[PDB]
Design a protein around this ligand. Sequence first.
Ligand code: HEM
Length: 184
Amino acid sequence: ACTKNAIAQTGFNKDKYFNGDVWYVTDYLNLEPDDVPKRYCAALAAGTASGKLKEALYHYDPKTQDTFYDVSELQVESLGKYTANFKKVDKNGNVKVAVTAGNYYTFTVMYADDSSALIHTCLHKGNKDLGDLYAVLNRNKDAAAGDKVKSAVSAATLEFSKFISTKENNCAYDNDSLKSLLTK
Ligand code: HEM
């Protein structure tokens, strides 16, 4: 179960975050033990497509090679805080698992600037019992976390030393699919 009401960034700039471009997860923190593997790759695109607020996600386990994409329309709870009902799709946007009630994630942007961000998500998926996940994002897949975002991790009362890096997994991303998925 999730336990955090994450606080959105004061003065969050939604148009800059949701500009159609790609964010890479460089470091993550799962609050519950063994919720997720200790080696993992993930990225997203975020933008408005034909007036609709969207995200496209990519997950890849670099050991098992398990891979999946998702597309969601985000609904607004408050500035920087969203609820997303997801559909699993192939990289071209063809539906593999349709939107269904009870399959949704919340998504809070705790900190963002033009290059980096800190987000929280609570995933709900059928009768999985998952816990809070925080992720440091960057526009550059290889970027070490700078002081702006590390300070935000501290301000959230978290220890950056506990976050697991994704950088030693040889992650390669299909940015073109992520951007085109925003329309799907
Ligand atoms: C960018 C932030 C992230 C978001 C918004 C997110 C969202 C999601 C969503 C929506 C699903 C279910 C997809 C589906 O079934 O169609 C999922 C599943 C999963 N995610 Fe993430 N994820 C993020 C980052 C990560 C990271 C960094 C990890 C590290 C391991 C991770 C591990 C997983 C795993 C293992 C599953 C499979 C869950 C299961 O079915 O048991 N995710 N995530």
